[PDB]
Amino acid sequence: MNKRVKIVATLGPAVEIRGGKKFGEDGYWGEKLDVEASAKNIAKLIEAGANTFRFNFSHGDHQEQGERMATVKLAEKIAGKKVGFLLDTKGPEIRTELFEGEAKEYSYKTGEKIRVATKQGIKSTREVIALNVAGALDIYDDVEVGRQVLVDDGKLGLRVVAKDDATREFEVEVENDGIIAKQKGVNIPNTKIPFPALAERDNDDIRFGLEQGINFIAISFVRTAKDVNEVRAICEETGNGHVQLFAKIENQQGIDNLDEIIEAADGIMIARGDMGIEVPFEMVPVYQKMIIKKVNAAGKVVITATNMLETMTEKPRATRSEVSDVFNAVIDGTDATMLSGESANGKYPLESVTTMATIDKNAQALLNEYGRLDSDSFERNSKTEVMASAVKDATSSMDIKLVVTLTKTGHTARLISKYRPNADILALTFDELTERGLMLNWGVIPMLTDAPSSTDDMFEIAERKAVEAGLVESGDDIVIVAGVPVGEAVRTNTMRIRTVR
Amino acid sequence: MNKRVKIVATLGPAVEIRGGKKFGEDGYWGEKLDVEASAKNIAKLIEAGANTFRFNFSHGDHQEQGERMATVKLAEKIAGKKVGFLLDTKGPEIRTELFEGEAKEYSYKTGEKIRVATKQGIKSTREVIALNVAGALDIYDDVEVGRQVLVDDGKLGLRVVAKDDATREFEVEVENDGIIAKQKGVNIPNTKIPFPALAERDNDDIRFGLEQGINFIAISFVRTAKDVNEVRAICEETGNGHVQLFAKIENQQGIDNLDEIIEAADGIMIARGDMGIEVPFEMVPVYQKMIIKKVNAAGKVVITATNMLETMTEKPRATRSEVSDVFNAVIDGTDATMLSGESANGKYPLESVTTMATIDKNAQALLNEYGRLDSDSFERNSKTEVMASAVKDATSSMDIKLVVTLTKTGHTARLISKYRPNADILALTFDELTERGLMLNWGVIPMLTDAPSSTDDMFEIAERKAVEAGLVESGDDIVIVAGVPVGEAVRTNTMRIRTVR
Amino acid sequence: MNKRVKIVATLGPAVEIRGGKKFGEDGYWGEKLDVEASAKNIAKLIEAGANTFRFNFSHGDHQEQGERMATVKLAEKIAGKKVGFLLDTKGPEIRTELFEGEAKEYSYKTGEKIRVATKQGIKSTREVIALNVAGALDIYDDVEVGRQVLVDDGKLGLRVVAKDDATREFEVEVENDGIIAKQKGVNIPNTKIPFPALAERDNDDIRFGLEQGINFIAISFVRTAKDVNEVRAICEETGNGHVQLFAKIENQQGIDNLDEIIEAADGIMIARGDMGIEVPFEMVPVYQKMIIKKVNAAGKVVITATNMLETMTEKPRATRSEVSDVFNAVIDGTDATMLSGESANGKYPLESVTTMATIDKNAQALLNEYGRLDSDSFERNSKTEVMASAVKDATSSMDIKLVVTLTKTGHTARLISKYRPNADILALTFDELTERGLMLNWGVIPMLTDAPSSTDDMFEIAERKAVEAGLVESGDDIVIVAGVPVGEAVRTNTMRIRTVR
Amino acid sequence: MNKRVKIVATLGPAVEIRGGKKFGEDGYWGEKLDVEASAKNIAKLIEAGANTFRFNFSHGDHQEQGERMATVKLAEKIAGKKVGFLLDTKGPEIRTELFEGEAKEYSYKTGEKIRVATKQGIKSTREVIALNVAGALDIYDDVEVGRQVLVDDGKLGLRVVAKDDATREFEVEVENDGIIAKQKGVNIPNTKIPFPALAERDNDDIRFGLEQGINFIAISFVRTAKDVNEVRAICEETGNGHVQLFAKIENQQGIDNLDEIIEAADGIMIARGDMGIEVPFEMVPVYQKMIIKKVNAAGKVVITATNMLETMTEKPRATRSEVSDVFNAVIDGTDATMLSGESANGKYPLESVTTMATIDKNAQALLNEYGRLDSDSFERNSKTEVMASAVKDATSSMDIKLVVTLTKTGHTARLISKYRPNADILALTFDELTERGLMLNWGVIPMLTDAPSSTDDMFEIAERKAVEAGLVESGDDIVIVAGVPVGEAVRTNTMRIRTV
Ligand SMILES: O=C([O-])C(=O)[O-]
Ligand SMILES: O=C([O-])C(=O)[O-]
Ligand SMILES: O=C([O-])C(=O)[O-]
Ligand SMILES: O=C([O-])C(=O)[O-]
Ligand SMILES: O=C([O-])C(=O)[O-]
Numbered sequence A, B, C: 001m002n003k004r005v006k007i008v009a010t011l012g013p014a015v016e017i018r019g020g021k022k023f024g025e026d027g028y029w030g031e032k033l034d035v036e037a038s039a040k041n042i043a044k045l046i047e048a049g050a051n052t053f054r055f056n057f058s059h060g061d062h063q064e065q066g067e068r069m070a071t072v073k074l075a076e077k078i079a080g081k082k083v084g085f086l087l088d089t090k091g092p093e094i095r096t097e098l099f100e101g102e103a104k105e106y107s108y109k110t111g112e113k114i115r116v117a118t119k120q121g122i123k124s125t126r127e128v129i130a131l132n133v134a135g136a137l138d139i140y141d142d143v144e145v146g147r148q149v150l151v152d153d154g155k156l157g158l159r160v161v162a163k164d165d166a167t168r169e170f171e172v173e174v175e176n177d178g179i180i181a182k183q184k185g186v187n188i189p190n191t192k193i194p195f196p197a198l199a200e201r202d203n204d205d206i207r208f209g210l211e212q213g214i215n216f217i218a219i220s221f222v223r224t225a226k227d228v229n230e231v232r233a234i235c236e237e238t239g240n241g242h243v244q245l246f247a248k249i250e251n252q253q254g255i256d257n258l259d260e261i262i263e264a265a266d267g268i269m270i271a272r273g274d275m276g277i278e279v280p281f282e283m284v285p286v287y288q289k290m291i292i293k294k295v296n297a298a299g300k301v302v303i304t305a306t307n308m309l310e311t312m313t314e315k316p317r318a319t320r321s322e323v324s325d326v327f328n329a330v331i332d333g334t335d336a337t338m339l340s341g342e343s344a345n346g347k348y349p350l351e352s353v354t355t356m357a358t359i360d361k362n363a364q365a366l367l368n369e370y371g372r373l374d375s376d377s378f379e380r381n382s383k384t385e386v387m388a389s390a391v392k393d394a395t396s397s398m399d400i401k402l403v404v405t406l407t408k409t410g411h412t413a414r415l416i417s418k419y420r421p422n423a424d425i426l427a428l429t430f431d432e433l434t435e436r437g438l439m440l441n442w443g444v445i446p447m448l449t450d451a452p453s454s455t456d457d458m459f460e461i462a463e464r465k466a467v468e469a470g471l472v473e474s475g476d477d478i479v480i481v482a483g484v485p486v487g488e489a490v491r492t493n494t495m496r497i498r499t500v501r
Numbered sequence D: 001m002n003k004r005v006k007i008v009a010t011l012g013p014a015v016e017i018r019g020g021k022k023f024g025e026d027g028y029w030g031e032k033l034d035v036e037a038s039a040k041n042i043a044k045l046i047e048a049g050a051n052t053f054r055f056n057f058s059h060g061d062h063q064e065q066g067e068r069m070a071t072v073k074l075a076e077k078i079a080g081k082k083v084g085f086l087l088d089t090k091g092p093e094i095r096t097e098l099f100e101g102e103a104k105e106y107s108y109k110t111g112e113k114i115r116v117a118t119k120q121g122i123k124s125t126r127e128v129i130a131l132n133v134a135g136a137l138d139i140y141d142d143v144e145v146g147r148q149v150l151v152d153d154g155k156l157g158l159r160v161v162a163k164d165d166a167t168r169e170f171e172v173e174v175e176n177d178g179i180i181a182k183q184k185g186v187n188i189p190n191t192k193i194p195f196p197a198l199a200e201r202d203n204d205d206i207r208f209g210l211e212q213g214i215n216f217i218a219i220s221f222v223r224t225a226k227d228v229n230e231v232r233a234i235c236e237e238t239g240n241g242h243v244q245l246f247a248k249i250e251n252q253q254g255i256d257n258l259d260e261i262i263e264a265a266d267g268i269m270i271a272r273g274d275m276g277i278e279v280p281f282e283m284v285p286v287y288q289k290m291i292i293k294k295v296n297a298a299g300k301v302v303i304t305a306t307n308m309l310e311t312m313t314e315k316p317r318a319t320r321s322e323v324s325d326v327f328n329a330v331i332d333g334t335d336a337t338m339l340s341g342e343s344a345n346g347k348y349p350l351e352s353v354t355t356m357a358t359i360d361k362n363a364q365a366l367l368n369e370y371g372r373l374d375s376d377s378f379e380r381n382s383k384t385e386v387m388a389s390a391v392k393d394a395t396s397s398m399d400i401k402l403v404v405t406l407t408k409t410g411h412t413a414r415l416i417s418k419y420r421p422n423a424d425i426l427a428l429t430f431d432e433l434t435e436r437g438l439m440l441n442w443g444v445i446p447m448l449t450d451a452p453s454s455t456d457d458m459f460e461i462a463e464r465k466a467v468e469a470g471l472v473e474s475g476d477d478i479v480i481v482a483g484v485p486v487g488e489a490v491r492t493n494t495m496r497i498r499t500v
């Protein structure tokens, strides 16, 4: 049984060994990274079903990121299995500043009047909270009376009741009892702070990642196609045209502009952390189902992200709600499910990947009956689309163990994946960029091979590689799909039904 | 635009020139057959859309039939297009005798009480009507009081009121005003006169046709599967196992046994002439629609026959009702529509074929919308069936100009035809028997090609043949289906969707 | 077992006894009309299943028409059943004139060069054919060179090769062997001869019919909504605004403007006679099916007309093609089928109505399985639509014997009819004008009653009237529908399912 | 905008004021019950959308349960809204015993060898854990080597490696690091401990609850139809035949016999607490979805229960996963969602009801598009079924603000509810047992009225009440359904589509 739903795991110190010490142990950080020991731990995550690692450039400098990418490349060799490399941008983050007097935090009561500063490069005081705004932008003219400033995963609400021109301060009322600590995330929902389409820091971070070697970029807080297009231009300028871009939908602007964002991007990450603060809490499931439906209809990749197994950061078992959440993301139609803190800085990273894999596997068993995606509704605008629809029908009518496609660019594999056939998809391709680039498509098992010389060669290759991989045995029926010749599926395509000898 | 519904045209003297004379001219039967001039007239029928010629063994002698079949082979070279050869059996007949005084006929009025004699070899009087029963069978014990004796295309009814065992006569009541003329057809519905399953006459005709080279046999008055199986036995005995049998459904027992008869036969001919006498006149459309539905569900051939354009025997234009009848047979799902006296004996054989072809082409354009048949009900149980379903869906999703099947036996062409794709079906086969055997399947264009060589590309050959025949040109999309490799005895396993060069 | 599909029978001399003579007996026309003997004949046509009588104003003076309608009014009292009264207009007919020297006809051969005169009031010669044009219109400028003049049901084609300004004659070439007899229909298709939207003759005829009392008008050669609108105006101005107009579609312009004609009209008459001459003969079935679908979708009345049982004009039994034509109009979804010459001018008027009834009743039994109409497509606008759809479902879900509606205007009967429930529709109504106005709606049995006093009253009346008509007995389930109060279903309507006690 | 998905809230000390002391105060149990102040707190739960109160007979004695039910009777009066009363049985619970020397708990490491005693009425030690088995059953012969004993919501596993015939103890290996505390839940999945169909303790609790007046019984650990029928016997014998029985499905036997249990019962409670310990944790969603589908198909009531907003027991905000969990239970086709510890003994009982109401309201808006249930599949074999199918189509075809049913038994409300019309369902009934008995059916607003005077009267009543309750105003389209002649207990056979 192959896991069809792909897992993105975020990496961090949780899997990393430093001087024989594990994360949280006394004097962990006083020790150099043990690359081999760390690489062996990361390999266990690959074996447990991680299909792509997320390097979150919100935390850690370039040397820390570059070192973690080098450790994953060693982990691939150890696992004898390849994974995708995904860079997640910092983007236009607002954080609380450091306090004067090195205070760590203060407690506030409902009804207190305090201020939020807009001046940059300054410290907070108990009564005047300063912001670290991405690119040191001045936000005073961008936030209107009646707006909400939310601190620390949306837990503490501050209502803007007046603005002070003299100090460029928001006069706010504490809406609920709570704590403001230093370096915590801040959200100001329903505003249009003019963060640039691509900030210098993100530009630098992307260029560094492209230099190291990546497959994917998840662009934080995408509001318009322009946020995607400015990243696409750098990928193209640097000869990294292979890189796929996932727009993170994290706020009302991104939801409002979803259609143009899907058009410009290679897929969507449903960033439920910022989204669950930026829109009403009970709307998140509506937006989750709507986004999965539209990305699937576009033949693109959707990643369902954030707090999926949150309790497993601290505890060895998920909650019943967390199991339901992961399971329903699969039934919704998600290509991939993501771990963030659970794999990056929790006590149980391998157990979190194992629990996600188990839920994802149990849920794929119910897609034929309960799946919310509806491939019958899709218009077939090309022969490769009508062939993918045919592959689906053949897997519904016959007991088909496996679909095998030979694909130069991944195009046939993506279209077959779009239709969600009740079969695994072995995608044979001829370069490592296309191979790693398919690792987040539903059901796709990418495998590197030599390009075939003829057509009849191609059907033999397809059956031999499937047999060598242990996906099929003598007497199993497979569906083989290729362009004729390979790479030309837009002009001429073929589907064969083959009994394995 | 190619006509998908097949036309069966009955041949007879209407197209035959004898020493420069036309049928009905003085001294016609005095001249010898002008074979070249007659073949030129038959070639015009082929060009106008005849796909199979019917040789009606109810009339003529074997020499006339063999000669006519040779005239057709010459016509095929003139038209550059082959047709199917169908033999229609005489079957069992009952005819009114000659009268004493050699009176031609008598007029009767409702309520008149008269007699029908069962004794063979006597003459009719006004008061006592004598019958010529096939085989001189004594039918006395087979017709009960309350049965109906019908005379002359069922235009005059005699009700059996009493039986006189002394004279073995039927005491009957004239039910309606009508004529009883000499040598007119008699029907006695809902009786089981023990006509043999295979009469000596039909044995002689069938074996003669088989020796000449026929593709189809239409068996008159099929009552049970035994009536089909006795003809199947002759085909098997003689090494003519490729010959297809169409059961003619003409009476109530045939309708009652329709399911077992379809299973035994290769197809049905809906014999509306006798059927319209043997069942209530207003029920024929019910049985026509029911038979077409059952035969399409069985994957077999149905022919709608008799009096489709009957007024064109004597007039240059059909009636509105005849146009409707032909049109609605197509909508009902018929493979083929038939001409009898209109092509065989009438003043306008060419015009009759042209009119039927025009009506059939106009109706096929409505099949996507108003089509009676529903391909969605078929069970995809085989490789060939799922592949035939794929073809249908490709043709429903894209503008497919042509479906090409490389078929040793014609099985794949028959399965694609059943699905009624919105495309012409080119069936490339490797022997003349298989090619002619496909001539009545809806939408199928049979074509003979050289058996594939080890180094032949079947797919390139398929496209090239379709281009040369003028069915497709550069930029058209076609579907090609084949059993790879080398069209062995390997089930169809491959579908290509191809933009034509 | 109630006949759901309605019959229009055209009246004429065929049913009229004159001085004890039947039509076509010697000296028939020399005798005065026997009103008692003629009414007894017409009453038999009612018992047989005629629902409406067509008075064709193309033939007969007002005195002949008036005596006929008066015969019909007497007929109902003999029958004890009412029927509808339909007036059909001469409209813009062209005819061949009388020939000089009392010659009845001439035969022509293909290639012959002759002339057609445009001057009115003159007689034809063999070499110069003269036209009787409606309202004595000059057509010389309104038909161009290359146009076709067709004589006698479009049997003989004359091709216009030149126009002679000096004589205002067409030089025409005979296109095929044929006869030009006196006072035969002439058609000049794809022309725009400026016939008034209403002609004084048609104005006058309509006003006469209204004085006698007509339920419907059929308007010949309707080209646009304009031709319907002018007839509407007269019906209102005379206090006859209750009169339903059927537009006759007979030509390309009527088909091209069908949507606007359907909007203005209450219904459509498919005039297959002129239609089959004015458009391609073999395309009539396409237009028939198309028109019936569109008129059902608008909730209006469609009549399939002309040559449905044509051979029964001369013979006591229809052809197989005629039986198919009637049967398939019912499957197409027609509300009504029509007899013209067969009931007006034929030897077998009563047998023609009996035959059409038998076929119609047989075909209605197949509507569930084979009905071409699709009630599921209709957008349920009003609550009246959704009530109608609900009644349809109740009759699909359970064994409903009958649907009873209490309707002031008939509007609930019209929407229930539109949905073609698997049940007879008893429409209880409160005047004779509304009750006859429903006689061409599919499945509707009109019945006069006095208005209800209470709601409990309205439901007890529906059931009592039903048991009294013999339509239902004890144990039969019926659906009752109504406005509350009766006749306001537009705002507030009710459906009840009741077992008869 | 009315909440169609029903809410069951468990009642407990969290809403109850003792003297002036809230729950978790210093010497809270050191006071009497402030009944009026408690009833005013419960009234706030009714206002926020609690449709039924659950009285969990696992915790408390008859006196505590009795007083709580009486406080609820007061809250209804304060709220001006009635609610259902549901008794939840203790059932065949296994718990850990009190410890030697009043020890609260001990912590264990993987691989540790210890013993579980089957002997009843003894204290636990660190090395030998004793069990408080319902009915004091000796379970020794019912658990084979290789079975698993689980403690505290299945958090700590013990693997039976051997059986000591001399002491009737299990030799177990600690499977994972964890804590054994006193009086914690114990599960022994995939065993057939011969607990009776109905234990004397459950018999007694049910009879006491029947005495106080209840609408529903939730039967813990239902294995077979016998477990339901033996409770039905008592509701019948005592003249409490109005009481509806929810089988709680929370072990493999329940799942295996689900069809026969649905047949015997009035509805199902999906008890995901025990169910997630008794079956593979990551399989609970499969059984939830299957159970909801089978119970809607039977036109019965399904409650999705346990840990739906768990974190709100201690925090003011639910997690993203908990929002997703409640939302998808609605999408799955649940009639009702439940709160246990969140309403019964947490810090935020009112905010818990409010959050569930908000998610449930938002989810019902997506049932027309993403709804799991499929009503086209139901057999239309009756006049009532045909009428219910006709109501659903009216609400699909038209913007219908409300369906009003005049129902003596509620049968017509239940059938209409089965079809999940896109509209609220006002159920006008003539006694208080029918009224309260409808309060867990999807979309049904029950309301008491006098049996009507006539057909015109009945249709007039229906509109007036709906207008009074503020459900609809002038220009609104409603569907009214009734059986005429009116009041004669006629099967519904009339539909009216009416502009108000
Ligand atoms: O950025 C994220 O992943 C989020 O906000 O969920
Ligand atoms: O997938 C591909 O490479 C194609 O388009 O043939
Ligand atoms: O034999 C036939 O074809 C018939 O009777 O129609
Ligand atoms: O058509 C054929 O020969 C086949 O596929 O069996
Ligand atoms: O006028 C007519 O009825 C016709 O042309 O069919």
Ligand SMILES: O=C([O-])C(=O)[O-]
Pocket (backbone or CB within 6 Å): C406, C407, C408, C409, C410, C411, C412, C413, C482, C483, C486, C487, C488, C489, C490
């Ligand atoms: O049928 C009627 O007259 C009505 O109720 O609209």
Ligand SMILES: O=C([O-])C(=O)[O-]
Pocket (backbone or CB within 6 Å): D220, D248, D250, D270, D271, D272, D273, D274, D275, D305, D306
């Ligand atoms: O009893 C319960 O409600 C449970 O176990 O979930």
Ligand SMILES: [K+]
Pocket (backbone or CB within 6 Å): C056, C057, C058, C088, C089, C090, C091, C220
């Ligand atoms: K006319």
Ligand SMILES: [Mg+2]
Pocket (backbone or CB within 6 Å): B220, B250, B271, B273, B274
């Ligand atoms: Mg025959």
Ligand SMILES: [Mg+2]
Pocket (backbone or CB within 6 Å): D220, D250, D271, D273, D274
């Ligand atoms: Mg439990």
